[PDB]
């Protein structure tokens, strides 16, 4: 079917083309690896020009028909959810395993043996890093927080945000503690609302313990703050998934007003129907009415005299963050409204942010919730977008630091340690696996050499220097300098990477490398 404009490669030209196709795509982000990596000018299909060095943003904007390069995109979707820092590093590491696999294919090595060769070599590298890793919480409690404060500083060190970075460092520590419990040790991104707007500065960003839900308070006469109402417990809010309207059948409608006589009849008719539905709010004792649909003019008049601020046009997902922070429930209809399902919070007020005329509102708690909302501002639209993604990566590092106390020192010291460990174990394991372990260690050298290239240094001369300091002297962690520093030995400069984070990166690199080798056949049809 559709023999024209149809290409197929099996067992001959596919093995050579799959390696060169992924090599040309991975070579794009090699220069962007590390904080010193170089930016790129990206153009959206709508015509917007953006500039960022993040590998995830660059790879996500790629829409391509290359069958092998799609496997790099499918993994990148899981990289942001699992880790988020394994975007550029794994793709370069996965392509390094492919370049070493192509050299073995030319030698007559079976591709599945290469897949099993990298799998057994990855398991040996985990055991070596497990012995040489160090503990944080065992060193001190405040030194752990010092790593969290400097974890966001590393991601923000390459951006203008680095001036005020001390503000966002504390926002990442207080947010993870609330949304994550030390039992499961998991930070759900769906429980963290990321919202930002253009204008102001980066120092005006505040950390809110609950949903923001910007609203104009409907009618302007309604008050800007919600009072406890004479010793009542917290502040009760109403979550309604049904619109507030006078009851009407499904058949006719067609309401015609001939004169003022019929105008006063319909006005008092709809007002009396509003008095029946507001009683359910009064019986439940809800201070503010939050609904998914808009309100009428007479609807806000009765809510104004009763001191009941009105909130209309709230999205479905926005109502989900309300019940989680305030420990409320989703009430489907008006007859099911009860005081037990009302969200309880500390207060609701309107806080002016800088010179912005939006004048958003803040709903606080003062108690530990199951969700938080990160609020970010900046003087430029790019600064806001870069600060949201850098904060997202900072929240993921903190998740891995608490989940696993063991960590490794990055900056090239981890990859060189993995190479010297596998190369030593390569001679201990004889047979075909000997060459499979040597090729795996040579592929691990791509990351520190790429970081050496991206640092403006000789990749070959620097790689031999790190191997000389970790052997003739003693076994330790000394990496390449990505950003200009005082000297080498990252262990002295306190550059830390999560062990479970680096372990997740090396597994996804070998997982995708196998799937690339497990597919020797590519069949694509034409474009009708």
């Amino acid at each position: 079917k559709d023999q024209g404009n149809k290409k197929r490669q099996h067992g001959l030209e596919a093995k050579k083309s799959h390696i060169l196709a992924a090599r040309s795509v991975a070579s794009i982000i090699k220069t962007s690896l590390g904080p010193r990596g170089l930016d790129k000018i990206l153009i959206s299909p709508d015509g917007e020009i953006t500039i960022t060095n993040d590998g995830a943003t660059i790879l996500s904007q790629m829409e391509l028909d290359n069958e092998i390069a799609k496997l790099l995109v499918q993994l990148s979707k899981s990289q942001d959810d699992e880790i988020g820092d394994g975007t550029t590093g794994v793709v370069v590491l996965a392509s390094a395993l492919l370049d070493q696999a192509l050299e073995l294919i030319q030698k007559g090595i079976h591709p599945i043996k290469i897949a099993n060769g990298f799998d057994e070599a990855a398991k040996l590298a985990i055991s070596k890093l497990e012995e040489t890793c160090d503990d944080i919480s065992a060193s001190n409690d405040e030194l752990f927080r010092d790593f969290l404060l400097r974890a966001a500083k590393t991601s923000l060190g390459s951006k203008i945000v680095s001036k005020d970075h001390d503000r966002f460092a504390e926002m990442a520590v207080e947010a993870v503690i609330n949304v994550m419990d030390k039992d499961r040790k998991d930070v759900d991104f769906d429980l963290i609302k990321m919202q930002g707007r253009v204008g102001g500065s980066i120092s005006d960003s505040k950390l809110i313990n609950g949903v923001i839900l910007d609203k104009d308070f409907s009618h302007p006469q309604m008050p800007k703050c919600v009072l406890p109402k004479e010793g009542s417990d917290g502040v009760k809010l109403a979550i309604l998934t049904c619109p507030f309207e006078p009851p009407k059948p499904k058949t006719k409608h067609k309401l015609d007003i001939s004169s003022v006589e019929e105008y006063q009849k319909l006005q008092t008719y709809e007002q009396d129907k509003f008095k029946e539905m507001i009683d359910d709010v009064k019986k439940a004792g809800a201070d503010v009415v939050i609904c998914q649909w808009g309100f009428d003019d007479e609807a806000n008049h009765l809510l104004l005299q009763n001191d009941l601020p009105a909130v209309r046009w709230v999205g479905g997902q926005e109502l989900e963050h309300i019940a989680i922070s305030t420990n409320g429930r989703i009430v489907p209809r008006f007859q099911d409204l009860s005081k037990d399902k009302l969200g309880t919070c500390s207060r609701i007020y309107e806080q002016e942010f800088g010179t912005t005329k939006d004048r958003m509102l803040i709903i606080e708690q003062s108690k530990e919730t199951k969700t938080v909302t990160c609020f970010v501002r900046g003087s430029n639209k790019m600064i806001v977008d870069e600060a949201e993604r850098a904060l997202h990566d900072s929240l993921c590092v903190v998740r891995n630091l608490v989940k696993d106390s063991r960590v490794v020192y990055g900056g090239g010291a981890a990859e060189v340690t993995m190479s010297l460990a596998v190369s030593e174990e390569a001679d201990k394991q004889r047979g075909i696996d000997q060459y499979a372990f040597r090729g795996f260690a040579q592929a691990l050298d791509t990351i520190p050499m790429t970081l050496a290239e991206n640092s403006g240094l000789d990749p070959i001369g620097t790689l031999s220097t790190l191997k000389s300091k970790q052997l003739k002297e003693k076994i330790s962690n000394i990496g390449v300098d990505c950003l200009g520093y005082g000297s080498n030995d990252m262990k002295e400069l306190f550059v830390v990477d999560p062990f479970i984070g680096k372990k997740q990166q090396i597994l996804l690199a070998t997982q995708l490398c196998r799937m690339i080798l497990k597919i020797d056949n590519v069949i694509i049809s034409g474009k009708d």
Binding site: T31, L38, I41, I49, N53, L64, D141, E453, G456, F494
Partner: protein, 517 residues
């Protein structure tokens, strides 16, 4: 095939050509328009009867459609100069293109990642801004007459504001809060204290930097010859959230014993505090009595709940810095103050710092009758301090006529004297781009640039050089005798914008072709 709708990633070397040859060609369009004697350019449309002629650099760049995606970024960079100031945008685009001419000569002769060359421009731009400060003069002369103009405009700003109750006292406070600075006019040097139970006219000015919330319990109320340290740590009840972690112990006392061991490791950091030779310590969180008792024996004074903002304003007036970690003892930048006094005003405990190192600053304590009187007084005062200080940075000029451009060239050449191995060419090329500015001014004026600049450089190189570009006689003449001066803010804006312009373009290794419209 990547991206979509005729959008593909250009070749690596072609990306640098589009970022240089493509951008310089756009920059060369308005390059001949620099100066009053510059050239002109015609702008023609498809209908050809709608065309026009103008010498405006901002009009030529924005009107001409640019298919080069690198040229679109250059237009967005030029918008920064228009929004910040709005004058001299043409000179910014020309100088930004001259940096690309030198960066192209540095790359093609190297072919190494430009990010290192970017660090060469940052060190060279700092030396260029330092040369503009040494040669900076002022029309600010007769500040006594400017003092009478500052107090009258301040009273005009107080109109319609609740501060209009007494105009003379509040305008005198703002007068002594500006002219007495003799330095940066930023609001971070002026601390605003808001208290209740007083009258607005009863407010006073204190040159010392004033805090609130007095520190310590058994600590003394006065500190003489204070050494200020900045750190962020929690010494009171560490391990904030212990819930959820599996605890296997024989008794509950081992949980608190572990917290004592976690704080025992902090004793090494407590010892590092005394190794700094300081009598005073500042922390954002609180501190338990036991680590505070160790501060008393070692002579350390603990300050609690200083937050961050208020700390940063203290480190600037005292000449210190903020750091949340201790890397190694006796390595840091420390601030100091002569006298620390604990006072009380408005029924609230306050702190008084006096005798800061090179301290230039003031603190305005306003007495309101409510929160509305305090909040509206702080915002309306900053609006008056911003306008009155705007005339301090402007009308302050430097010697112009190409002089200061060459003065920066020899200053960058001085930076090119003591320099790293691979950073010598990156810094030296920055001085080459500074020497291309008088070359362009001589070419647009119709003169010989090689004869003037060579005689202008050799004269300004060594000593006794007031000389600059004289376009009337076509020779090198003294600018001080001719009275040719240009604003210092214009020099600082063009150099800073061109430095940021080089950062945006050089950090881009590969450029994707923009969507054709």
């Amino acid at each position: 095939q990547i991206f979509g709708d005729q959008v593909t990633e250009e070749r690596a070397e072609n990306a640098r050509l589009s970022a240089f040859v493509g951008a310089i060609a756009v920059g060369d369009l308005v390059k001949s328009t620099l100066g009053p004697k510059g050239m002109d350019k015609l702008l023609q449309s498809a209908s050809s009867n709608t065309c026009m002629v103008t010498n405006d650099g901002a009009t030529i760049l924005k009107s001409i459609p640019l298919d080069n995606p690198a040229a679109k970024v250059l237009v967005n960079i030029s918008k920064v100069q228009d929004d910040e100031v709005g004058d001299g945008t043409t000179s910014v685009t020309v100088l930004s293109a001259e940096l690309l001419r030198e960066a192209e000569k540095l790359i093609d002769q190297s072919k190494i990642h430009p990010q290192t060359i970017i660090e060469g421009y940052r060190l060279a731009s700092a030396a260029a801004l330092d040369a503009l400060t040494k040669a900076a003069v002022d029309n600010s002369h007769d500040k006594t007459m400017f003092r009478e103009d500052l107090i009258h405009i301040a009273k005009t700003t107080l109109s319609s504001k609740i501060l209009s109750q007494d105009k003379d006292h509040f305008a005198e406070l703002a007068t002594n809060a500006i002219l007495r600075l003799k330095g940066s006019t930023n609001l971070e040097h002026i601390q605003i204290i808001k208290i209740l139970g007083g009258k607005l006219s009863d407010s006073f000015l204190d040159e010392g930097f004033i805090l609130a919330k007095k520190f310590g319990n058994n600590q003394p109320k006065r500190i003489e010859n204070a050494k200020i340290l900045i750190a962020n740590t929690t010494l009171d009840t560490d391990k904030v959230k212990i819930f959820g972690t599996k605890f296997k112990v024989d008794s509950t006392a081992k949980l608190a014993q572990l917290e004592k061991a976690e704080r025992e490791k902090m004793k090494n950091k407590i010892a590092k505090i005394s190794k700094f030779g300081i009598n005073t310590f500042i922390n954002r969180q609180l501190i338990y009595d036991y680590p505070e008792q160790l501060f008393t024996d070692l002579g350390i004074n603990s300050i609690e709940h200083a937050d961050f903002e208020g700390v940063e304003r203290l480190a600037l007036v005292t000449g210190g810095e903020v750091v949340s970690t201790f890397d190694e003892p006796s390595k840091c930048k420390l601030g100091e103050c002569d006298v620390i006094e604990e006072i009380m005003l408005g029924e609230q405990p306050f702190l008084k710092f006096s005798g800061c190192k090179a301290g230039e600053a003031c603190t305005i304590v306003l007495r309101g009758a409510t929160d509305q009187t305090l909040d509206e007084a702080e915002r309306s005062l900053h609006d008056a301090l911003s306008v009155l200080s705007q005339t301090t940075k402007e009308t302050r000029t430097v010697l112009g006529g190409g002089c200061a451009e060459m003065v920066m060239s020899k200053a960058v050449d001085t930076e090119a004297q003591n320099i790293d191995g691979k950073k010598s060419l990156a810094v030296e090329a920055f001085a080459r781009a500074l020497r291309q500015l008088p070359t362009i001014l001589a070419d647009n004026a119709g003169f010989d640039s090689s004869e003037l600049v060579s005689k202008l450089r050799s004269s300004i190189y060594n000593g006794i050089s007031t000389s600059g570009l004289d376009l009337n006689n076509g020779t090198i003449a003294d600018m001080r005798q001719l009275g040719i001066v240009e604003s210092y803010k214009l020099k600082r804006a063009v150099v800073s914008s061109a430095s940021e312009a080089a950062e945006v373009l050089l950090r881009v290794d590969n450029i994707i072709r923009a969507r054709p419209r």
